[PDB]
Design a protein around this ligand. Structure first.
Ligand SMILES: COCCOCCOCCOc1ccc(C(C)(C)CC(C)(C)C)cc1
Length: 230
């Protein structure tokens, strides 16, 4: 189950993972400077980030306005105006989710960057003060191989890596929406790993890790290779 508020590693992962999933986009460079142009790839990049932050409810096709507000409150940032526009059901398209949130973004850019650690100084401070989280610049394998993290406090073998690959969340619950298609894992294959993982504790993480590796032996190696900055 997802935890809120989202921390600086969790927000960083959502941005970078969604950037990788749209890496051929014409507007990629604009996203780097916090500009979200009105084009299809940007629409779907925006939907991806809302989803990967844990802020899109796929069941009612609505933003988790309650958790968005919690992020502001937890970060001591004033609640922005215009919340009504981002609230309520969408039709599920990238276009609709973009249209419902673009003014909210454009009208509150720097407060949103503050609340979601989108400022280098604020992110650097979070990581400095949370040394038990994988630092930027360090690979998942190198971090999780240290301090017996892969054991998960028990007898596991991939407890830490499965978390940082986002196969499972902090609760060792599988992350159902994870997209590893470009790594050679189809949606059906990933779903089968989720289903294979009534297991309990970090055994869910190990089951997800082993199942993914079984489908494609390189996929998790690629995520590890990408992991210094995701
Ligand atoms: C290599 O370094 C790349 C760093 O880029 C990280 C910043 O990502 C770019 C910003 O992109 C977005 C994506 C989504 C959003 C939304 C609209 C979803 C708002 C948000 C993040 C405040 C919830 C805003 C900016």
């Amino acid at each position: 189950m997802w935890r809120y508020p989202r921390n600086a590693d969790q927000t960083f992962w959502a941005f970078r993972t969604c950037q990788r999933q749209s890496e051929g986009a014409k507007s990629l460079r604009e996203w780097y400077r916090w500009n979200l142009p009105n084009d299809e790839d940007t629409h779907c990049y925006v939907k991806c980030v809302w989803l990967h932050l844990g802020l899109y409810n796929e069941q009612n096709k609505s933003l988790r306005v309650d958790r968005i507000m919690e992020q502001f409150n937890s970060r001591s940032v004033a609640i922005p105006g215009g919340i009504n526009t981002i609230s309520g059901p969408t039709d599920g398209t990238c276009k609709d989710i973009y249209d419902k949130t673009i003014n909210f973004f454009n009208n509150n850019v720097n407060d949103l960057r503050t609340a979601f650690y989108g400022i280098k100084k604020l992110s650097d401070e979070w990581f400095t003060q949370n040394s038990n989280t994988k630092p930027k610049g360090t690979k998942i394998s190198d971090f999780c191989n240290a301090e017996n993290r892969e054991k998960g406090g028990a007898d596991c073998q991939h407890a830490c890596s499965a978390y940082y690959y986002r196969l499972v969340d902090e609760d060792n619950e599988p992350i159902h929406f994870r997209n590893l298609n470009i790594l050679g894992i189809t949606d059906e294959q990933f779903a089968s790993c989720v289903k294979a993982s009534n297991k309990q504790g970090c055994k869910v993480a190990d089951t997800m890790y082993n199942c993914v590796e079984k489908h494609n032996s390189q996929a998790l190696k690629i995520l590890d290779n990408q992991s210094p900055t995701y």
